[PDB]
């Protein structure tokens, strides 16, 4: 590897976490979605 | 390697480290150098008188009558025990002379200036990022249908398409806002969402304008640049200059180019060190020691060795001797224990310390790989293009 | 006796009526000045400097009441060979002493191990060291604006294209005003600015949208990594750095490298192996004037100058167009030479002792050091 | 006023062509801007005291 | 060898090997600035 | 600085070394391997600011 420095950084898991609130966010958006909507 | 001067015009004389040699009726001229020193330190331990003189005749041997032009033609003139000069060891010089392992290794290079980038645009965008995007049409188009349940111009999931997937780049579509408040809610999700997303884009941008990586040489004496010199349309020069060691190297590596290179072939090692400067040329391959020696020397920051410095046709340089000489088992020894000084740090200082430092960054502005962009882009598009009679067909 | 210099002291001529204009501190202070000897270029002068105040300051100590000469050299002194009488003399200041020409010993010169052999001197009054004199260079790196931020090939190449491609998604829209509102869809998707009026019914066309808004995301980010590396970085080289920097450690004819002539500073380039082409060179080449080495700097004759390091430090202050070295050389310090003996002596001894005992170092600072605006 | 910050609020749209093109100017000038923003953020980022 | 009256009262010292004073050493810091910091405010006149 | 100093090897008030040892001094600062005393000591790596 190239790993002297850290050029190589493209999140993916470390973003994928927040990506995953963001889905997280969807679920919620069902339970509030169908709850509220009634 | 080595380095002369005029004497002091007041004394006529070199003071300090310097030493004497004449030149022709030969007249004194400054004996200087740091690989010289390493010959005083040499003959120091070894106890053996050193004296100068001035090559007159080519640089180091050849046959070309079937005899050397120089230094070693003196050895064959054995006007000397030995003498000094970067020794390229070589097959020819091998059958010619005697000589030991270097005081300094040295090798097959060349020099191209410093370059006056295709990634950065999907570069840092981890692939699973465009996957995390289809996902986003996924749980998209699904909050869409379930929030028009209750719910239930529409503004289809097609349309919401267009509306999320606005979101998608930077928003920037005004037409049809749904109005479901838990649905607004959900534009909440994707919205932030993009926010942080947008966020990933810009460092991102950060890292890959953070990141260098320049490289971009040629391979070597198999280099494809060097394999056809017709085949790009400026022809690539890289040489030296005539009656070369490594340009005999050369001479059987590749043909090819030695032909080709005649051409563009130069006189001087400094002098087309200096069309470098005006790059009149491509580059110029020298001895990698040598060359390195005309890497440290920089007017400002320009040249660049061919590649990081690999090795090619790896050699070195010393003093060598006649075939069954004296000092031979001792001159070794001799360089046995002046490597075995450490002071070779002192020849760094003394010549090989360099100030062109090592490894790395002007500002790119240029298409180049964001014509890249633009490339994939009208792509996609003729894509949907295509796409689209297959729609009217549809 | 001592000479003028801006670490050590600033005096021009005094007034018509022979006098000093009355100055007081940015502590509002009008400290103390006095009259001086001074050179046409044997005339008056004044006495003004922050080290001469502390010489009035050892006065204040033990009283004795200080008689200033100009300095008729500008050094101190180096013994060294006349033209015959193989006597090594030094000529100047500690000549003078030497000569007795003054009592007091009055200058901020390092304490010479050469010169120590010649005659003693006191503890230091302050640190101080040697290096060479570094001058800035044009910071410029200002540039390109937005647009050279851009390719302007490529700008508005991208530019004209999405109009083209417009027109394309424009045949999406005439084939199955649009075209004008297409015109405020694709530049407006530059802005990216929502004019407003709509997206296109056709969802290939509008996939081409998700497109062209791609090649905006892109392109914002075009300028943001753009502007990103023009605020990076930055300048390649600004070098000096080792004593044995390679610039000094290759003699050539392109880098001019000096130090003062006849100095303490010359002297720690003096007696040595190293310095042989330098010494050597810089001597050939060297200026006389620390005036003129300021001078030289603001003039940018040579590539290079040394002097008194921390005086430099000093002297940093004096403009902005120079720069400061790396890091220490030979270093000593500021102190009163001891000629013989003197009840001065062990007396200045307890007036550096009290001195770095008290503050009043501190008030130097304040009368030089402090006013660093650098 | 809205590109002043990031443009961002969606309502009344004067539908003038040439204010539309006037739009423009102002518009892209945001761009410029909040690039200038941006590096900004990153001089700062990069700007250690 | 701390230069010290009492000390130079009490014995003889020549300058020293080495130059020295007082000082503390806080650990490394575990801003203030940015906000409005590069923003150059003729940009606002702008 | 803050309240400046040294340190070395001192002696009592008169002393036999003491113009002498004070030479000493003179020409160890002439030697410039205080740089080595950095070496065998006050090279740090710590680095700088």
Redesign the interface.
């Known amino acids: 590897d ?1 790993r002297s420095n850290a ?1 190589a ?4 898991e470390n ?2 976490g ?2 995953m609130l ?2 997280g ?2 679920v919620a ?2 339970f ?2 169908f709850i ?3 | 390697f080595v380095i002369v001067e005029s004497v002091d015009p007041l004394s006529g004389t070199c003071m300090r480290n310097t030493v004497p040699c004449q030149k022709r009726g030969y007249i004194k001229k400054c004996c200087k150098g740091f690989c010289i020193d390493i010959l005083k330190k040499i003959s120091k331990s070894v106890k053996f008188t050193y004296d100068l003189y001035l090559v007159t005749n080519g640089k180091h041997g050849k046959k070309i009558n079937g005899t050397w032009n120089g230094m070693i033609g003196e050895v064959v003139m054995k006007r000397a025990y030995m003498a000094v000069g970067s020794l390229t060891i070589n097959e020819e010089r091998s059958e010619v002379v005697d000589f030991s392992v270097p005081f300094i290794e040295t090798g097959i290079s060349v020099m191209v200036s410093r370059s006056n980038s295709p990634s950065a645009f999907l570069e840092p965008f981890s692939a699973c990022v465009w996957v995390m995007m289809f996902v986003m049409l996924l749980i998209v188009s699904a909050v869409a249908v379930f929030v028009f349940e209750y719910f239930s111009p529409s503004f289809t999931i097609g349309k919401a398409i267009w509306l999320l997937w606005g979101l998608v780049f930077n928003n920037s579509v005004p037409v049809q806002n749904p109005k479901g408040t838990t649905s607004k809610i959900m534009v909440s999700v994707w919205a932030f969402f993009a926010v942080i997303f947008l966020a990933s884009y810009t460092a991102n941008l950060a890292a890959f304008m953070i990141q260098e990586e320049y490289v971009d040489q040629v391979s070597g004496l198999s280099d494809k640049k060097f394999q056809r010199p017709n085949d790009f349309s400026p022809p690539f020069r890289f040489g030296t200059v005539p009656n070369g060691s490594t340009e005999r190297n050369i001479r059987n590596n590749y043909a090819e180019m030695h032909a080709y290179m005649g051409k563009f072939n130069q006189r001087g090692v400094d002098d087309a060190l200096l069309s470098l400067k005006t790059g009149k040329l491509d580059a110029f391959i020298y001895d990698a020691a040598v060359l390195n020696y005309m890497a440290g020397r920089d007017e400002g920051c320009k040249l660049v060795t061919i590649g990081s410095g690999k090795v090619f046709a790896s050699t070195g340089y010393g003093i060598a001797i006649q075939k069954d000489s004296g000092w031979k088992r001792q001159v070794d020894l001799a360089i046995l224990q002046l490597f075995g000084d450490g002071e070779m740090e002192e020849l760094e200082a003394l010549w090989l310390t360099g100030i062109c430092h090592n490894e790395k960054m002007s500002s790119q502005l240029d298409i180049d790989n964001m014509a890249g962009v633009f490339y994939m882009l009208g792509a996609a598009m003729a894509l949907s293009l295509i796409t689209f009679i297959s729609e009217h067909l549809f | 006796v001592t000479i003028h210099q801006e670490p050590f002291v600033y005096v021009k001529p005094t007034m018509s009526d022979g006098t000093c204009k009355e100055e007081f501190t940015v502590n509002g202070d009008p400290v103390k000045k006095v009259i001086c000897t001074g050179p046409n270029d044997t005339v008056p002068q004044c006495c003004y400097g922050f080290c001469i105040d502390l010489l009035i300051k050892l006065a204040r100590t033990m009283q004795f009441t200080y008689e200033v000469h100009l300095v008729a050299d500008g050094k101190f002194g180096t013994q060294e060979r006349v033209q015959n009488s193989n006597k090594k003399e030094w000529n100047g200041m500690m000549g003078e002493l030497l000569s007795g020409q003054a009592d007091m010993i009055v200058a901020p010169l390092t304490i010479n191990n050469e010169r120590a052999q010649y005659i003693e001197f006191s503890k230091p009054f302050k640190y101080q060291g040697l290096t060479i004199l570094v001058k800035k260079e044009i910071p410029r790196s200002t540039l390109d604006s937005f647009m050279q931020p851009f390719q302007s090939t490529l700008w508005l190449l991208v530019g004209l294209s999405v109009h083209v491609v417009a027109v394309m998604l424009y045949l999406l829209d005439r084939f199955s005003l649009t075209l004008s509102s297409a015109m405020w869809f694709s530049w407006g998707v530059l802005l990216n600015s929502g004019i407003g009026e709509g997206a296109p019914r056709s969802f290939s066309a509008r996939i081409l949208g998700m497109v062209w808004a791609g090649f905006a995301m892109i392109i914002v980010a075009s300028y943001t990594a753009n502007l990103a590396a023009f605020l990076v970085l930055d300048r390649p080289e600004e070098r000096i750095t080792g004593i044995n920097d390679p610039r000094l450690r290759n003699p050539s004819d392109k880098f001019i490298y000096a130090t003062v002539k006849q100095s303490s500073v010359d002297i720690y380039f003096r007696r040595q192996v190293e310095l042989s082409t330098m010494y050597r060179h810089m001597e050939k080449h060297n200026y006389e004037s620390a005036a003129e080495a300021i001078q030289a700097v603001r003039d940018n004759k040579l590539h290079a100058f040394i002097w008194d390091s921390a005086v430099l430090e000093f002297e940093a202050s004096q403009k902005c167009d120079l720069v400061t070295t790396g890091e220490l050389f030979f270093r000593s310090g500021f102190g009163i030479g001891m000629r013989k003996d003197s009840p001065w002596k062990q007396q200045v001894s307890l007036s550096i002792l009290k001195s770095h005992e008290n503050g009043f170092m501190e008030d130097l600072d304040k009368t030089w050091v402090r006013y660093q605006e650098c």
């Open positions: 190239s050029p950084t493209l999140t993916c973003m994928a927040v990506f963001v889905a966010g969807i958006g069902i509030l979605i509220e909507i009634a």
